[PDB]
Amino acid sequence: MSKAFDLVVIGAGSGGLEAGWNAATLYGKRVAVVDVQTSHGPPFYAALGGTCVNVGCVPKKLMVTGAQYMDHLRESAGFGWEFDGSSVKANWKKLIAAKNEAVLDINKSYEGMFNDTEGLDFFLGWGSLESKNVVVVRETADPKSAVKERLQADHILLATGSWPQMPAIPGIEHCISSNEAFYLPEPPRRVLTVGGGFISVEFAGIFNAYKPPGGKVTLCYRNNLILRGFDETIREEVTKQLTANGIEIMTNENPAKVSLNTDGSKHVTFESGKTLDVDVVMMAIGRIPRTNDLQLGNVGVKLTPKGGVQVDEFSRTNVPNIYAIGDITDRLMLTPVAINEGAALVDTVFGNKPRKTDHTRVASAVFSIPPIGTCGLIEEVAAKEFEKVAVYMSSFTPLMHNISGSKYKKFVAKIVTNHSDGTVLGVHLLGDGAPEIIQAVGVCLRLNAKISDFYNTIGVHPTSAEELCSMRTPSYYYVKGEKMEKLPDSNL
Template identity: 40%
Template sequence: MADYDYDLFTIGAGSGGVRASRVAAAHGARVAVAEEYRVGGTCVIRGCVPKKMLVYGAHFAEDLEDAKHFGWDVGERKFDWKKLRDNVLGDVDRLNGLYKQTLENNNVEVFHERATITGPNEITLGSGEKKTAKYILIATGARPHVPTCPGHEYGITSNEAFHLDAIPRRVLIAGAGYIANEFAGIFHQFGAKVTLMNRSDQMLRGYDESVRDRLLQISLMKGIDFRFNANFEKIEKQEDGSLLVFMSNHEPLNVDYVLFATGRVPNVEGLGLEDVGVSVNERGAIQVDGNSRTSVPSIYAVGDVTDRVQLTPVAIREGQAFADTVFGNKPTTLDYSCIPSAVFSHPPIAGVGLTEAQAMQQYGTVKVYTSDFRPMKNVVAHRNERSLYKMICDEPTGKILGIHMIGPDAPEIMQVAAVAVKAGLTKADFDATVAIHPTMSEELVLLK
């Protein structure tokens, strides 16, 4: 490897790229990273971390209302969006510094400029300087997809949502995935009139139908509007600065902002992939094998830029597996089955394993256990919102095939439940476990 400037050159310093670079360096590799924006990637800078902070802030709207039923006189309530926004962005700066420090502490050289692949072992930096490496890792992530319709330039994406000067009075959110539903809950709790539109008649495709139907019911009860089977026709800017949105199958809607949350597109443009022969699929995502290797043996890829699962923890695991395999003499492949996930909506949902429909298709005979209950806190707070826990099992063996839930702290509870599902435990194992009372999580060992 002494024939090259580096053993590893990583393009992109997001979650996957930072983990791969740090671990490779710890294994003794000479590593460099090129990042044209900020270290930390989508999750830390403009994704799950700042969004979760907004979710925390949004929950206080209902918590302060509920507090009155618990004897608290909260006085006049006033929300300062700019204070929350600036505090969140300030913590993003802190995390950006920590990520840079992590690379520096592991002797990873960082180039704060764009990089292009100009050969199987060659990278050209934005400055024109060329570097060589035994291996190249692409970890450039993805970006929000923006629909093409007249006036689409008037819309914003989740990237810009963290920097708004004020909470919009009326906002249309396009999409029905986790980003759309999370921002719908955030903006609604901050006082905006929220309308969520989707081109199909379903939301949160891939989650269990019972759970997503419950979220739809609760969201409607809270006052969030939905427009299904709607496609953009055009967006017109009005004299007062508002936006008039024309869509199929529905009347035009006048709003202050249009937020596009219609999926994410792999960042592959301008990387030089076609020049070196790296294969991509019809979506532009890089195709890789079980070891994250592309069609070019010396070039690998991890994270959202690939044709696998677009989740931060998955990118981190892929980066770790790559570094251990290539530099640590520890061959590692990632198991993509039974990956838990969550939507930080209001209330949040979480799931692991097969949905009821998937289980029936694969196993034929399944047994479904449910608990439909009102959390104790909601009872005292006079809030009618109900939680739903659901366990799907293989009927002959009792093996748990999937667990799905909606309710307060569902993602926190699901993390431990996911370990049980991954381990192949049965309904009998849960039944044999003593409940912690009174908790919401005890419903998992009391399911009927």
């Protein structure tokens, strides 16, 4: 009578929802959506709306913004602003509540989005894969827990997102991930964030701003240089500016064991023998694809070398009617890329207008302090796949920071081109504005903009972004993969 579902979706995240909505309202398809919670927060943290809405994008930006105010208050003095210095208090409990109310607002809107949209229905619980055309809902992630639904499905979309990777050292239970950090009752006086990724960096600034008096945020990384994958000079610069803002950046170090002290603080021993006492130890060493609770062995879905789900240019798996999008694919773990993959999967299946999503030349940010903006390739990657590579550099200390009192806040801007046709292959910014600036740059790369298109554009003065139009000559080259300043005389 009610049949199956033209599509069932496991995980109602960024991609899960964009697919179920573009199907119930765009194609009148029957759609089911399974997620494990309706409101943000413990015990599962991520809930209806995805990691982005509950324990990622939205709540992180709000907290970084709140953390920027530490700099604002300090820098106002240069512009003549005075107020009781010793009376300032960074009220973390107040910040978390403001955030929680923002998140729950989105939780309810989506909560209502399902209650007035025929063909779109929400099923609370855990989704496991039974047959190649049946999704199993259970009260908990345990495969032997009670069942509440068995959703007959014509198409099955896997969109469970990803999960924080934890290492195998003694005392790892005394550690937290990004998940639990959003819900600390109090701000930690001493915090150690492990790893070098954007999550560890972004939370180092947040903790650094709301820490009570006498606190130290120590970031450790097992290798030499943090923010692996981002442009090099931006990496060293960001390291320098994190230090300036009081964060201890402790590279070439790795926790080896963690114990509790008589007061509940964590005692951390490293692989190099050095010890550190902190009140919180946050692991941010990577995000793995979230596939364990899916029972993908019941149907034989294939996984890549990394624990991720294998897919093609259309998000299809070996099983004919099973697709995967979002962070479960282990590709570009970004929200708009999951929204793009989801929207594309639908109108290629339920709309016979096949259009895939482009994974190259994608804009992304890193709301650190200072923030990062990037798009395209970095210079050392362009080298390994491009004849002649040009690099445009420019690192001015912004206008206002001679007054502000923050001379260290050096704004950086790199452009990377194929020197043959001058086509821009990358753009890398560091400094306030980088996230908002890079967005419109993403459109340019989608239009094959050559460098001439940039410096021949009239600037908007005075801005930081004008520095992208002010670079007319390379600072060095990458020819044959090698880096020398000058570019040796032709010779074919």
